[PDB]
């Protein structure tokens, strides 16, 4: 029952301005683009980058958004966080699944009737060994909007909630509030770029006007994404939060951040320090002139026997390990305690070289802890 609606061309910029909810840019994904006065709408909720924390906004008067999904590409290869809305319940299904590209929910204009409204959500084609089990109180109840902020710090997804009834504004024009209470769901996941989930509760079989004659869609979800700032917030009586003053919004707010206070007396103040950083990394050594005499041990006319093996000592010179290792002429190289990638930074007092003649079956016996001929 999975359907695909990924053929759409969203707005390139998709940028909106938020005053204080600091003063950053949040994506304005619309997912409802009517082609002129007559045409068919297109739904598109592409997977957006997580960017270590994401804030989502509903801005729906009919609860169009029913949660969010998160995790990897969700192709039955890794665990993916899930969140869905039941009739009166909260569903968390963080597990491994391989669902369709576009999540969809079931809605058939469930008005006042004998409870015969058919619905079917296609958001989980398969289900692996689940690791999530938590049910909370569902939240369903001149404007209506809501928001939530998700942040996974590998120990607990300290979610947020903004159930305050924001109104008398187009879309977050000036928010003089700060609230983020929500129930945490501690689980072990490696959540990659996430995606939204919407319910198409706009189809009507008895519309007065054709071509989406309903009042609104309205899948206007605002997502925006985060940065590791150090904004300074002061407590409030009754445990609330009064305002939020950042330490790097502008030079004025940095003065308030270093003074640990909101007001600033007229004068001059020192906040931080500046320092230009280096761009490259250089290491210099004296010129390489006196190479080690390695020709006597690699192109010798004759070699030694087993009982009369010769000993060669190499010292008081420089030995280039890159040319010897990158020769494309040998086939056996094994040792313990050192690695070829660590040979570039190590020095020893003396190097001893030995060579002899062995048989075909006398090559595996050169190893500590073994016996042989």
């Amino acid at each position: 029952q999975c359907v695909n609606l990924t053929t759409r061309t969203q707005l390139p910029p998709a940028y909106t301005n938020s005053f204080t909810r600091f003063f950053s840019n949040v994506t304005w994904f619309h997912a409802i683009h009517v082609s002129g006065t007559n045409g068919t709408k297109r739904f598109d909720n592409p997977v957006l980058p997580f960017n270590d924390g994401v804030y989502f906004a509903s801005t729906e008067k009919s609860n169009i958004i029913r949660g969010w999904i998160f995790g990897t590409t969700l192709d039955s290869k890794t665990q993916s966080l899930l969140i869905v809305n039941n009739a009166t319940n909260v569903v968390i299904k963080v597990c491994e699944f391989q669902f369709c590209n576009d999540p969809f929910l079931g809605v058939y204009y469930h008005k006042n009737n004998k409870s015969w409204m058919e619905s079917e959500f296609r958001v989980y084609s398969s289900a692996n060994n689940c690791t999530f089990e938590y049910v909370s109180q569902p939240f369903l109840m001149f404007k209506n909007l809501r928001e939530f902020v998700f942040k996974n710090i590998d120990g607990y997804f300290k979610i947020y909630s903004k159930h305050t009834p924001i109104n008398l504004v187009r879309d977050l024009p000036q928010g003089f509030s700060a609230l983020e209470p929500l129930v945490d769901l501690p689980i072990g996941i490696n959540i990659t770029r996430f995606q939204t989930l919407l319910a198409l509760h706009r189809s009507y079989l008895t519309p007065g006007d054709s071509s989406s004659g309903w009042t609104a869609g309205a899948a206007a979800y605002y997502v925006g994404y985060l940065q590791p700032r150090t904004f300074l917030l002061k407590y409030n009586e009754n445990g609330t939060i009064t305002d939020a003053v950042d330490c790097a919004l502008d030079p004025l707010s940095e003065t308030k951040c270093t003074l640990k206070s909101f007001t600033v007396e007229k004068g001059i103040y020192q906040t931080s320090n500046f320092r230009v950083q280096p761009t490259e990394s250089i290491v210099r050594f004296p010129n390489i002139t006196n190479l080690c005499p390695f020709g006597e041990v690699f192109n010798a006319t004759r070699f030694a026997s087993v009982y009369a093996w010769n000993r060669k000592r190499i010292s008081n010179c420089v030995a280039d390990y890159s040319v010897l290792y990158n020769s494309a002429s040998f086939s056996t190289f094994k040792c313990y305690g050192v690695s070829p990638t660590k040979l570039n930074d190590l020095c020893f007092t003396n190097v001893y070289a030995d060579s002899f003649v062995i048989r075909g079956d006398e090559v595996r016996q050169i190893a500590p802890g073994q016996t042989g001929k």
Partner: antibody, heavy 124, light 109 residues
Framework: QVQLVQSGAEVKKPGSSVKVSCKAS????????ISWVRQAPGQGLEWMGG????????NYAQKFQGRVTITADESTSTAYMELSSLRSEDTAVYYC?????????????????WGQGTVVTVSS | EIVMTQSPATLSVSPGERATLSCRAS??????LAWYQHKPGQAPRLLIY???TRATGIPVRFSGSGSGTEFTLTISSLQSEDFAVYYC??????????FGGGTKVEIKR
């Protein structure tokens, strides 16, 4: 008073691609959702896929991806379906159903109000 | 991919009698069923959509009944021209749609 006109019968050699187009006139072509149904001897009716009415996309079916491509034009009100990769069992008669009228939200797989029918045969 | 079947494969009903067609599905097909009539040399024509409501302009002889995965199609009036191939399509998903084997309407003799 809605009438659907499909393309005539054509013969396509193996290894070639054939496009079949069905045109709808006298009705809400923009609000219609075309589909493809092929019936062949020795087997039941098979539906390759269809176009979503509400959204609009080439919703294929199982064992049909990469073989049949369907595109719909709002201006021309005609849908053309292309077997590319053309074998013997693929020769059948295709039917078009644009007026999906028995389902819930986003009706699909109408199997109703079929077109005239275009005959496609594959031979050397 | 749901599986549906139509029985009997061949039915011999004399003219003026009642013809009964039984449909079944492996999933809940109480409100998801398609009935169409097809003839040789022409594309199939829809007869009943949803197994509960007859199409506009269709003959009143054709009718459908049943609940759940089982559906029954009954014809009050039997005609020689009305005798054709009928099939039931499974609509459990939106995807892929799986039509039934179909039935051949024979003349009793």
């Amino acid at each position: 008073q809605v009438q659907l006109v499909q393309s005539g019968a054509e013969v396509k050699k193996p290894g070639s691609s054939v496009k079949v187009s069905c045109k709808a006139s006298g009705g809400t072509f923009s609000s219609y959702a075309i589909s493809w149904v092929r019936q062949a001897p020795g087997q039941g009716l098979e539906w390759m896929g269809g176009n979503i009415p509400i959204f609009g996309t080439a919703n294929y079916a199982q064992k049909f991806q990469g073989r049949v491509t369907i595109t719909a034009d709002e201006s021309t009100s005609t849908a053309y379906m292309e077997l590319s990769s053309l074998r013997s069992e693929d020769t059948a008669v295709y039917y078009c159903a644009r007026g999906v009228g028995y389902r819930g939200v986003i009706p699909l797989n109408w199997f109703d109000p079929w077109g005239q029918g275009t005959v496609v045969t594959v031979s050397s | 991919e749901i599986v549906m079947t139509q029985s009997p494969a061949t039915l011999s009903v004399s003219p003026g009698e009642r013809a009964t067609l039984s449909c079944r599905a492996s999933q809940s097909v109480s409100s998801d069923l398609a009935w169409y009539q097809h003839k040789p040399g022409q594309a199939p024509r829809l007869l009943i959509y949803g197994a509960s409501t007859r199409a506009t302009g269709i003959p009143v002889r054709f009718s459908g009944s049943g609940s759940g995965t089982e559906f029954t199609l009954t014809i009050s009036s039997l005609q020689s021209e009305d005798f054709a191939v009928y099939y039931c399509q499974q609509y459990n998903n939106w995807p892929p749609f799986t039509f039934g084997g179909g039935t051949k309407v024979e003349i009793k003799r």
